[PDB]
Design a protein around this ligand. Sequence first.
Ligand SMILES: *[C@@H]1O[C@H](CO)[C@@H](O)[C@H](O)[C@H]1NC(C)=O
Ligand SMILES: *[C@@H]1O[C@H](CO)[C@@H](O)[C@H](O)[C@H]1NC(C)=O
Ligand SMILES: *[C@@H]1O[C@H](CO)[C@@H](O)[C@H](O)[C@H]1NC(C)=O
Ligand SMILES: *[C@@H]1O[C@H](CO)[C@@H](O)[C@H](O)[C@H]1NC(C)=O
Ligand SMILES: *[C@@H]1O[C@H](CO)[C@@H](O)[C@H](O)[C@H]1NC(C)=O
Ligand SMILES: *[C@@H]1O[C@H](CO)[C@@H](O)[C@H](O)[C@H]1NC(C)=O
Ligand SMILES: [Ca+2]
Ligand SMILES: [Ca+2]
Ligand SMILES: [Ca+2]
Ligand SMILES: [Ca+2]
Lengths: 484, 515
Amino acid sequence: NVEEETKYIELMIVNDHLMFKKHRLSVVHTNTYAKSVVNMADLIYKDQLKTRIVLVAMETWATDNKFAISENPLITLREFMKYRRDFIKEKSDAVHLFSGSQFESSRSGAAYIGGICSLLKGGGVNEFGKTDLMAVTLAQSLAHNIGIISDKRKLASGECKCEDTWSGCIMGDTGYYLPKKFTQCNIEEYHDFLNSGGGACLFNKPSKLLDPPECGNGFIETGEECDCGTPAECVLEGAECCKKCTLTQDSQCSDGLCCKKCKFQPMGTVCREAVNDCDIRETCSGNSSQCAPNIHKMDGYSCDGVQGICFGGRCKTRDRQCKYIWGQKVTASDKYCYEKLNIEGTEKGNCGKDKDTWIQCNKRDVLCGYLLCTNIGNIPRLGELDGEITSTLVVQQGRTLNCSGGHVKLEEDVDLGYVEDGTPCGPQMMCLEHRCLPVASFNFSTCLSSKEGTICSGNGVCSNELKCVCNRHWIGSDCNTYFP
Amino acid sequence: KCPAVCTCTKDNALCENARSIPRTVPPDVISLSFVRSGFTEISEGSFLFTPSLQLLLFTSNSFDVISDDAFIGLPHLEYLFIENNNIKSISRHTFRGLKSLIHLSLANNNLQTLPKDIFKGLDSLTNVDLRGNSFNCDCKLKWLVEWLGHTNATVEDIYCEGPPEYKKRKINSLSSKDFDCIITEFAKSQDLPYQSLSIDTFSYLNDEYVVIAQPFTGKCIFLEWDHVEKTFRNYDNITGTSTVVCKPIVIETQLYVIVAQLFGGSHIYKRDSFANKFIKIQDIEILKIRKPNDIETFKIENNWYFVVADSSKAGFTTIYKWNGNGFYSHQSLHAWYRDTDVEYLEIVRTPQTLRTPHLILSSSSQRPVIYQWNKATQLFTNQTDIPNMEDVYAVKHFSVKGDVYICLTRFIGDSKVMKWGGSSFQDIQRMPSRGSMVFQPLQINNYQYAILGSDYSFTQVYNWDAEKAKFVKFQELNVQAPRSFTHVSINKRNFLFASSFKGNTQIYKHVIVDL
Ligand SMILES: *[C@@H]1O[C@H](CO)[C@@H](O)[C@H](O)[C@H]1NC(C)=O
Ligand SMILES: *[C@@H]1O[C@H](CO)[C@@H](O)[C@H](O)[C@H]1NC(C)=O
Ligand SMILES: *[C@@H]1O[C@H](CO)[C@@H](O)[C@H](O)[C@H]1NC(C)=O
Ligand SMILES: *[C@@H]1O[C@H](CO)[C@@H](O)[C@H](O)[C@H]1NC(C)=O
Ligand SMILES: *[C@@H]1O[C@H](CO)[C@@H](O)[C@H](O)[C@H]1NC(C)=O
Ligand SMILES: *[C@@H]1O[C@H](CO)[C@@H](O)[C@H](O)[C@H]1NC(C)=O
Ligand SMILES: [Ca+2]
Ligand SMILES: [Ca+2]
Ligand SMILES: [Ca+2]
Ligand SMILES: [Ca+2]
């Protein structure tokens, strides 16, 4: 089960110069302080989301401020992700910025929703505060990156409730009484994010901490051949194997999915099955106690048949986009509704806005325009509704369809209700900037191929890291060699 | 008929180097004197069988104690001079039995003490001489001060030799000041089964009622003095969820109570005329006031105001002006800050002589800020922060004579007291404390105390020193997690309430001791 596995977030913290100066212009003080923030936030995540946060890298700017910082947390998020994309070469699952400056905004931080395991969207930005306070800010920013949302139809109506009346929850507005517990709806939103193929890279268990090793913490460091969650919880797994963080001769694996009674897993035995049509199921290597790093299908693979194309292990269609924006009860409209709406160029259907003008949508880009859905509620599940709702009824041979849409705002330039980039408009077609374009316009790649015109020689599946996962009866990097 | 130890003329007797007092004198002996005799002590109940004595003197002798009633049997005794000896202590009723005594001298024998009302029973006294002794001046010499001004008999001046603080000072020139002879103690009269947070009092029809904010179970408790064989009894509850602060206000003989919670928390009640049932009047918006912490009530220039400390960055601190029907929004302060506490204080801002109302609110990571009232715009315009102290959780105020001081609370570090100058606040005293959630001064019958709580160690209670101009360690209270301390004054009875967050809350009784 994807929920039962204790996941790990590889976090890299970057401290700006103002934060460095508030900490006595000293490297050790800033380092210890950020380590403590990560410690508290991890104490929260451990009990709540069954996910540990491990800090493997940190860089503080004591020389000079690299880019132009802004009072708007969103601009600072964009520019910081530009700095990571153009400069930061360290490997990490997420990169967050600790800023000493104050943001003029209602939010204490900004992070891309569901951006985890991205190079561009994998980051977050948090402002300065006390220890527990910035622990909460980092907790809610990473909650954004991990797919948790604060508002929802269920929460707005009252079904989703924070049951702590003396302090809010983490996704709520923060006061002087700081939240310690998430709502169950946040938990289930995370679980839905993982069941959708999101956040694949979070299964990598860090073996190297940047801090001195410690026994009984749950992580295997240098000088110790095995580790347990605690000497008290070891008894559940790894008490026959590991004593004083050392294994007896009969055992080499303390604990893990692939370890059973101090024995590794047989090679090829399945640790985790595929969660969707984008995920590839992983088998135990018979070398390590943990299961192989999570791997999904490479971008450009078809999911849900031909209705979607895989991105980061997550399938993007317009039906799942309707259900994501306006709730689970929503279903995508029939193609007649888009096909008809784009020709009129009215407010209800449209493909975009240049300067207060509607573009006459092309017939190939029909399904890259205004996103429409049949049964729509009054409130968006996330973001806020800009303008009012859209409802166009269409009749065909006596059949009546209320095709409805809306403009949902997250960021000033990020507008839901538009067909998301990478969503297929047609077979071997995809939607980009509200236009149907071929797939060869995306610069796609596909793992080393042994047979012609076939992905991984047609005997295997390409991975996001550009490596071939051969099927049965096939071995190699190109899957060329035959092994019955 | 005269002892061989003494040299005696017809009417006088002079004894030197006597071991014990001879009780047999010639009948015509009038005056008697003892010089450097080998007496250990005066004989208990001595000088009987010798009633003819009028003058009696002792000099250069060695006495450890002079027993009570030592001079009984001397109805004709008039002059008595015990001087130039070395004596430690004498008993009070020594001089008792001598109504005929007129002149008395205890001078120059280096006495350091005298028992209260030693001079009672001597109503014929005219001259007394106590000069030349080393006087350690405390409550004994306080009663002595009482006697010096009240006796018509003449007394030459005498001076304090101790404590070294008071040296060469006339005992005649002393007053009740600088003599805290009265001891004050705080002892718990009652323990309450519930954990508490905030406490406040109000007076209605000579009855005093106390309100407690119980956070977890959400009980706003109203209790009263039972006056019938009972110290305190809870007479009414108000039920809400996550109550923080329960602050009552009385405007024109009408009882209103403000309760604050974090969800749907803004509420204003009014007591029913009949059955004393509290009825909710107003609900302030949830969207503007979120996560409240402190609430303070203040009236400025024939108008009642009301301030809430918004602990959330989203919500803002808000002041509410009250028209006839209810409270409504007046002003908002400190946007996008986490306000921990708010306080109202009227101070004299120079060059101006009258007082001007001021507000002091403290944030989480920020220095406290002060707002000056502006009458023309009905607002607070001049906003300044008090420098050189951070992480101040709460600020409380008290006034000693014409000076106004403030106690600023710090959880870990130096919670310090400061003096209000003409322009800013001046450092007075630095007091370290651990786990301090409250630093509360209290004024009880011209006694300024200052209580500094601790969730970890004992709560340190301080007392005011008038001439040292600062606080001094006074007493230690045992309260689990103190949050607020409140002074409650009943009819001639004084109590203090101590909040306890993780334990049962305490009720102490203020007692005053006369020594
Ligand atoms: C596991 O070990 C074998 C050698 O015993 C090696 O060929 C294989 O590549 C290893 N696989 C992994 C995932 O480390
Ligand atoms: C049309 O839209 C309204 C809301 O605008 C909705 O209540 C109704 O169910 C829709 N009608 C149909 C037939 O879907
Ligand atoms: C990616 O496409 C761009 C133009 O869109 C081209 O300049 C570049 O060479 C391509 N990169 C690769 C690795 O093919
Ligand atoms: C003398 O004693 C009387 C009372 O008997 C008192 O009123 C008066 O003040 C005394 N005078 C002095 C000088 O102490
Ligand atoms: C009032 O509250 C107390 C606890 O604080 C409770 O024991 C008592 O039953 C309550 N009384 C009423 C009348 O609700
Ligand atoms: C009040 O003084 C502060 C600094 O002491 C300043 O920021 C503010 O402008 C002053 N207000 C007015 C009305 O002059
Ligand atoms: Ca990882
Ligand atoms: Ca370890
Ligand atoms: Ca996988
Ligand atoms: Ca206050």
